[PDB]
Amino acid sequence: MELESSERELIAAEAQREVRGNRAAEELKRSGIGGIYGTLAELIKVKDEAYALAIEVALGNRADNVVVEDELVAEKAIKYLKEHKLGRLTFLPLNKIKPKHVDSSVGLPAVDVIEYDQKIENAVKFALGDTVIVNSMEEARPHIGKVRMVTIEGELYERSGAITGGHFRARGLAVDTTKLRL
Amino acid sequence: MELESSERELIAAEAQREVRGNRAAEELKRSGIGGIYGTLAELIKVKDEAYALAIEVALGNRADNVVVEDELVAEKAIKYLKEHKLGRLTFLPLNKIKPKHVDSSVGLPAVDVIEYDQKIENAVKFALGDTVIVNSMEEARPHIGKVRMVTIEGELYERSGAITGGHFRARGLAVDTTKLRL
Numbered sequence: 001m002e003l004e005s006s007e008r009e010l011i012a013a014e015a016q017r018e019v020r021g022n023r024a025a026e027e028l029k030r031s032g033i034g035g036i037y038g039t040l041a042e043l044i045k046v047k048d049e050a051y052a053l054a055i056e057v058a059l060g061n062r063a064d065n066v067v068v069e070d071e072l073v074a075e076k077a078i079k080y081l082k083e084h085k086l087g088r089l090t091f092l093p094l095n096k097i098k099p100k101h102v103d104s105s106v107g108l109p110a111v112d113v114i115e116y117d118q119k120i121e122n123a124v125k126f127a128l129g130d131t132v133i134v135n136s137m138e139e140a141r142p143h144i145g146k147v148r149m150v151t152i153e154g155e156l157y158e159r160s161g162a163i164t165g166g167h168f169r170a171r172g173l174a175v176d177t178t179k180l181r182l
Numbered sequence: 183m184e185l186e187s188s189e190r191e192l193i194a195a196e197a198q199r200e201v202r203g204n205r206a207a208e209e210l211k212r213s214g215i216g217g218i219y220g221t222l223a224e225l226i227k228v229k230d231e232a233y234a235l236a237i238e239v240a241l242g243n244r245a246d247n248v249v250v251e252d253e254l255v256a257e258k259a260i261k262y263l264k265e266h267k268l269g270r271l272t273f274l275p276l277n278k279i280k281p282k283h284v285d286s287s288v289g290l291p292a293v294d295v296i297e298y299d300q301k302i303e304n305a306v307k308f309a310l311g312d313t314v315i316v317n318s319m320e321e322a323r324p325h326i327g328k329v330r331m332v333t334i335e336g337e338l339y340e341r342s343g344a345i346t347g348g349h350f351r352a353r354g355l356a357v358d359t360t361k362l363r364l
Contacts, residue, residue, distance in 0.1 A: 020202050024348075061243075065344065071323065071326055071345065074345045074347075075319065075323075075345075075347075078337070078345070078347035078348055081347065081348035081349070082347075082348055082349055085349060085352070085353040086348065087348055087349065087350075087352070088346060088347065088348035088349070088350065089346070089347075089348060090338075090344050090345065090346040091344065091345045091346070091347075092343070092344055093326075093343060093345065096326050096327040096343035097327070097342060097343040097344065098327060098341075098342050098343055126342055126343075126344070137257065141253065141257075144253055144275075144278050145278040145279070145280060155260070156272075159280075160279060160280050160308055161274070161275060161278035161279040161280055161308075162247065162272050162273065162274055162279065162308070163253065163256045163257075163260070163272065163273045163275065164270060164271070164272040164273070165256075165257075165260035165263065165264075165270065165271075165273075166206075166260055166263035166264055166268065166269055166270035166271060167263070167264055167267060167269065167270070168269075168270065170267070170269070171267040
């Protein structure tokens with residue numbers, strides 16, 4: 001991230017996602033259930049640090065979704081979660097999950113700035129396939145409700161028209177600007 | 183909820199949503215910004231306790247979304263959140279937000295079991311407008327990816343094909359079945 005504020009935002013966003021979310025995905029890899037690939041967070045790599053915040057924001061909770069071979073794998077995994085009291089997960093079955101697509105030239109498709117195994121493409125395009133990265137809130141307002149957009153600084157415009165904004169980074173304890181304790 | 187397990191699930195789901203989520207919506211009502219109606223959680227009432235868990239699950243995080251008059255209200259509110267370091271919110275602008283609709287006879291439309299002010303209908307139908315309530319996971323599998331469904335016991339099938347399941351209720355400390363301390 002170029003700006004300090006952007007870097008702080010990214011660290012904060014990442015920290016908050018860790019607190020929400022459920023490490024149960026790890027326990028699933030010891031269930032013996034085959035056909036579980038992992039979370040999108042484990043499967044997607046950002047190609048360019050300039051878009052790290054945009055991709056974190058555009059993935060949002062989808063980062064914690066678990067990619068699986070099919071709906072049978074999902075139902076088996078859900079039984080395991082229930083039996084072992086491991087909370088909840090969202091599963092993305094490769095044969096069912098519907099890819100989304102960009103249908104405009106408003107900006108840079110988010111999928112262009114990530115790397116992932118072609119095998120899980122349906123899951124990746126479901127999460128990020130119609131997301132476009134734009135530079136600011138100004139260059140976004142005309143398309144609210146018609147294009148999914150994320151700004152470089154981390155505002156999110158769902159295609160539905162839902163708008164998400166504000167700082168990820170918290171206020172924290174105040175720190176004297178004066179050097180009162182050298 | 184008929185079953186004890188369902189009631190426990192509902193309490194747990196509600197408690198978990200409270201911990202996630204941000205009470206910043208309350209601070210917004212003191213910003214002087216007009217055209218803010220409140221969160222969907224404050225605006226929707228369940229008509230029948232039998233569907234309380236289904237509606238909690240089908241709303242999910244949308245329960246914390248803030249309904250506003252238009253995108254101008256959203257952008258003003260986002261500036262306020264940033265200035266006062268109040269974290270993030272998702273806004274639903276009534277003039278932009280896209281209602282969803284049920285296009286099948288698979289089961290009971292979720293909107294049929296709630297009450298809400300007609301004024302915010304676009305926001306409510308955006309969240310719940312294509313959700314159908316079905317009785318179990320069995321009566322659901324054929325339509326994975328073509329109908330948004332929630333089971334009475336709280337599994338969620340997004341129209342995309344994403345499947346969410348598992349207990350909301352936590353294991354907790356073990357409790358002797360033996361009466362060892364009368």
